[PDB]
Structures are given as structure tokens and as C-alpha cells.
Design an enzyme around this catalytic site. Sequence first.
Site, PDB file in Angstrom:
ATOM      1  CD  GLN A  82      -2.634  -1.303   2.441  1.00 25.73           C
ATOM      2  OE1 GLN A  82      -2.013  -1.166   3.517  1.00 25.73           O
ATOM      3  NE2 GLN A  82      -3.882  -1.786   2.381  1.00 25.73           N
ATOM      4  CD  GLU A  83       5.528   3.194   3.388  1.00 23.79           C
ATOM      5  OE1 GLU A  83       6.090   4.267   3.774  1.00 23.79           O
ATOM      6  OE2 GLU A  83       5.442   2.149   4.089  1.00 23.79           O
ATOM      7  N   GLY A  84       3.919   1.466  -1.087  1.00 21.15           N
ATOM      8  CA  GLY A  84       4.689   1.537  -2.311  1.00 21.15           C
ATOM      9  C   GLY A  84       3.723   2.039  -3.379  1.00 21.15           C
ATOM     10  CG  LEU A 142       6.953   6.499  -3.171  1.00 16.06           C
ATOM     11  CD1 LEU A 142       7.104   7.898  -2.599  1.00 16.06           C
ATOM     12  CD2 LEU A 142       8.071   5.593  -2.741  1.00 16.06           C
TER      13      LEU A 142
END
Length: 405
Positions: free
Chosen positions: A127-129, A132
Site C-alpha cells: 500500500q505504501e509503495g 508513493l
Amino acid sequence: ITSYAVVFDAGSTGSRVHVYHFDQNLDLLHIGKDVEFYNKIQPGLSAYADNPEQAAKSLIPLLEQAENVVPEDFHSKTPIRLGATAGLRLLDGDASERILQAVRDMLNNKSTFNVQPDAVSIIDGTQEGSYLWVTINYVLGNLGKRFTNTVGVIDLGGGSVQMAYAVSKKTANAPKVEDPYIKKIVLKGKPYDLYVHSYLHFGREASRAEILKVTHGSASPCILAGFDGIYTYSGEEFKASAPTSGANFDKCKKIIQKALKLDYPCPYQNCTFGGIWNGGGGSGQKKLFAASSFFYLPQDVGMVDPNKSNLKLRPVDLENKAKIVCTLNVEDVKSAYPLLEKFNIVPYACMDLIYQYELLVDGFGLDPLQEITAGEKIEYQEALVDAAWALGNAVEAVLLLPKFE
């Protein structure tokens, strides 16, 4: 005609609020002299693990500021969201779920903003990747372009590393499997198939423990001369002492290759390391933005021009740097590179540089002469945006509004 969005980032040491104002073309409008309102409080939600209601109370001053920033006529249609970090999970029992729920309650009780059912959550690795990837390609103006003109992202966090880049509808033939490998997202009405993977144990801090495990109780040639001590990660101790001849680029590189598990058998068409499918490569991965520790390290060893928040580099630049630093001792490195002394990581200078080189080249298959951008922030107009998930999260939230669809 315009929309606001409020995004909290609840980190391990502090909580931050970001307020954005998007115009009708989804371009950011300035708020005062910046492209967002930003403010931070300390400590973080986890300082309040034993008292959930107080963890939520910690945020109220930030909330009240964001309520003042967003003009009252826009409050009801403004999405508010909080994403918490890695570590919150690292709390006992269901301390973490109790804190997240106290935050939902507080937002619903004290905010006038639009709280959706998925407003408050932990932002896991993939999710973070993915977020970003959105932050970076939003900033560069690539959303709505064919995947082949988007910029892949790599994020070297404390515990994990993420890779995210866009692939073809065919490639999305992706193996079944754990975090799935494809995240489907529509941006500006265009569907993307985003290859995403988070590698646990391979963040900047965590990687040192993988590396020192290879040499078990013995000296490691990944450690500089003049250090004879202990590295602690996740409550485990790892002996960290230089052999009598000090660090050695060559031997340390071999140990690192071992630690990456480059030789792990590949169950798919091709792999990075550890048996992980590489996503197939191609155009979406040809330009790259490397965040977090991919910038901190160059910054700390004098590779970045003063008061810049990103740089261009080739992976060979890291290798060339290690070739020198791996001949130095702790006193030499301490004196040359005070930032490393600030962060208590002088002994690991050689290790961290070889690690990044190996991770990029041997692990991810980047050419060691290919330029990439590494940064903690990216340029947007005259301003700088955090190279992190908050903006991409806001962008997604806003794109869900019927006005912006």
C-alpha cells in the site's frame, strides 16, 4: 470547483497533518506560501498504547488546525484520512486496533469533515509503495499517460524495501500466491496495473541484521576497523566487530550477496532475490525515483549538494564510494561524515553502501550506469513535496469525488 483533503500520518515518534487544496484540474493550489498545510506533534500514537482515548486526543490540536485551514463551507465534502505506520503493529495485544478505533471515534465526534468507512488504517508495505508511486507520478504530471511514460519507485524504509511500477494489461499472467503482486488503480480515469512488492527484512536497519547473521558469532568484514560491539534489531543482538585487518569491500560484498538470497530458486519467469517475481521489468521501470534511505545514505556521506533534498546518481556511485570508505576506520569516517555520527551508524558505513549497491544492481537488476533520482522530497513548482505516501493517498481520495470523476 475545488476540493480539500486532509491526511494524517501517524508515525512512530510523531503525528503529522497534511492539508491539500486541489483545483478543478487536480493541480495543487498554494496554502500560504506552501503547496499544503503541514504541522507535526510529538509523541506518536504508540506513546499512548496503554490509553487509546489519549492517543486520539493527541491529534486534536492538529485536527483543529486543519479545520481552520479548510473554509467551513467545504468541510462536509472534504475527505479526512489517517494512515499509521509500520511499528503500530509492533504493539502488544490489540493495542493497535484499539488506537485506530479511538481515532475513528474522535474524528466522527470532533470533526466536521467527511469520514469514510476506510478512513483510518495501517498502511502496509505494498500500500505504501502504491501510494508513493502515485505521489511521485502525480508530481511529475504522468497520471493519465500510458504506463510506459510513468516513473517506477523504490522505497528503502527501516524494516522493508518496496518496489512499485506500472506494467501492461498482459503482464498483469501474474503469479497467484502474502501481498498480491498487482494492485489495480484508476487515476484520472485511466486504469493502471501496478506491480508492487514489499520485502520484509530488507529495509535499511533490518538489512544489517540479515548481513551480520551470515557471520554468526564471528567478526564481519562488513564492519569498519575500530568498532567491536553489538548491533540490536527487534530485540536480537548481533555481534558487530571488524576482523583485525578491518572492513573489506570484496568479502563484505560476498556476505551481502548471501544475505540477499540471490540464489533462491525462482518459481516464476524471473526473480529479483528470495524467489520474488520481478514483475517483468520494461518501460515502467526505466526511469526511477528511489526514496527514504536511498537518499539518507548519500546525504550522510557527502554525495548531495548542501540543502538539496534529492540528487541524481548511478548505482556505480555507491560502489565507488564503498571502495574508499571500506578502507577507512571509525575515527576516519566519524570525522569525514558527522551525520553518520549523529545517527550512531558510523561502524556500518561500508556495509550500508555495498548493501544499497547490491540491492539495486544484483537484487533489482538496475544497470549500474543508469541514472536514477534518489530523494526525501521531490520538486513541485517552486516547492518540495515529501517523497512518501500522504500526497498520493489524498490524490486517490479526491479522484473518488463525483466532482473530479
